[PDB]
Structures are given as structure tokens and as C-alpha cells.
Amino acid sequence: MVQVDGGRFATSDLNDLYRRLINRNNRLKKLLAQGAPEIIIRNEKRMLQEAVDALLDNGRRGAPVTNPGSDRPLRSLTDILSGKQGRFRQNLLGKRVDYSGRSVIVVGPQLKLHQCGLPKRMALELFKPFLLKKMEEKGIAPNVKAARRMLERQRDIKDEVWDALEEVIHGKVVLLNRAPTLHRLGIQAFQPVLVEGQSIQLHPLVCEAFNADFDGDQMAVHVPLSSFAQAEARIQMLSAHNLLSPASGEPLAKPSRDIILGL
């Protein structure tokens, strides 16, 4: 039960399913002490059951309970746990993540197979913690907390900042992902080449595995943090290290379109 921007309150549904039960339980404790007739107590015990069952699995038996003036069934405990929107599938088998961004992809014919074009604007936010430590170690700012103040207004950012980012990203890879990820080559590692502009630059040879064209496709960037994550990305997930399909064994990175046309 939290106060939103507007000062208004937003409350989970479980509270109204609990209040429902606590009212019916308390009224039953009072009806018992006052020796009410059988027809009354049994009606209360039925409603107490029906309240327990709206709380554990609302809708399973009988009519789903609903907040007045809206036909939305309240979100019971079962509903929270299950389904595509449930807890397992939506929060345990797949989460949202930090150090990640997306943008529109654009062809980069001049890229080596292991490379991609990464907007310097994205690279700043994605590697922000690394950039702070490097700024303190060079001298572009005196303490890490002042450096973060510098990057907060787009005007305060200076030139030597972008040279610090280049020192930072050296040798390290970023993961590129296009949806849907139908097989493991929907995520491939790349050495990021910093570029001006907004778009991500993709290598033409990896467009088939991703099934990416340039009719507006976008791709997600992910920054492997640990040395272990960096090592897994550079050895096992590098585009240049995954040339043959894992399903057929045939080449996947291979000439197509203009490349074939020219040859």
C-alpha cells in the first residue's frame, strides 16, 4: 500500500481479499458468542469458506469476487503464481536487466565480423560505472561522485570524457540480441566500435542468424560485467567463433544478396 506521485494510494488486490476474510471471520466469532441460530451460523461458515477460496484461488469455484464497479476479477494468490504473467515465467525464468539498452539497427558494411557500431551516447550510460572509475584514475574529475555530476547535464560533458570511454571498453565485448530469439544465434557478442549518432551498426554477415534486415529492426545491447562473463562472451559467443549452424552443421555466416551478386 504505497502513495503514488499524485499522493493517491495504490494497493495490492490481496488486501481486499484479506479484509473480506477478516470481516467474515470476526463476524463469525461474534455470531458464535451471541448464540445465533443454526441457519445463521451455517450461512456465515459458508461465506467464510468462500472467502478462503477467493484468497487462495479466486474464480476456481463459483463467481470470481470483484471490486465494485469493475468486472475485473481480483488477483488471487494462484493467479500471481501461474500463467504467462505469473511469478515463475515473468520474474524467475526471465527478468528485466540493468546494463542494457536498445536502438534501431543499421548496416555497417565496413565492420569486421567481430564488430558492431555502438552509439557513444548508449556506451556512456551502459558503461557508466566503468567510466567513473576511469575518470578518477586519469584526473578528468577528482572523485567518482563528482564525475557522475558531470555526466548528468549534457552540456557539462567534456571531450576527454569520450576518450575515457574508449580506454574503458578496450578489448571487452557487448552482447547484441534481436527478438525473437529462435536459437542461440539471436544473441551474439561483438567488439563495440563507438560511433556518433543513434543507430546500432550490425555486420551484414550476421543478419541471417538474427533474421535482421533494415526495414526498422531494433536490437538490444547487454554489457557482460564480470571477467567471467567477459571471457564467456569472447570465447563462446563471439560472432566470428560461431560460423556453422548448430542444427545442420552448414555455414550460417555466409555470402548473401549484394555479396553474392558482386561475386
Binding site: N43, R46, M47, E50, G62
Partner: peptide
């Protein structure tokens, strides 16, 4: 199967 109709 309907609590109102049962009590009625």
C-alpha cells in the same frame, strides 16, 4: 452452487 439461492 449459488450462495444466495441456497440461503433463500
Amino acid at each position: 452452487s449459488d450462495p444466495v439461492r441456497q440461503y433463500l
